Amino acid sequence: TSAQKAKAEERKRRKMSRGL
Numbered sequence: 001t002s003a004q005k006a007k008a009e010e011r012k013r014r015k016m017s018r019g020l
Helices: 012-018
Strands: none
Touching: none
């Protein structure tokens, strides 16, 4: 919920590697 206002950006740092 309130995380959707940022979590989407928190993955931009984890996907850089496991972005598949």
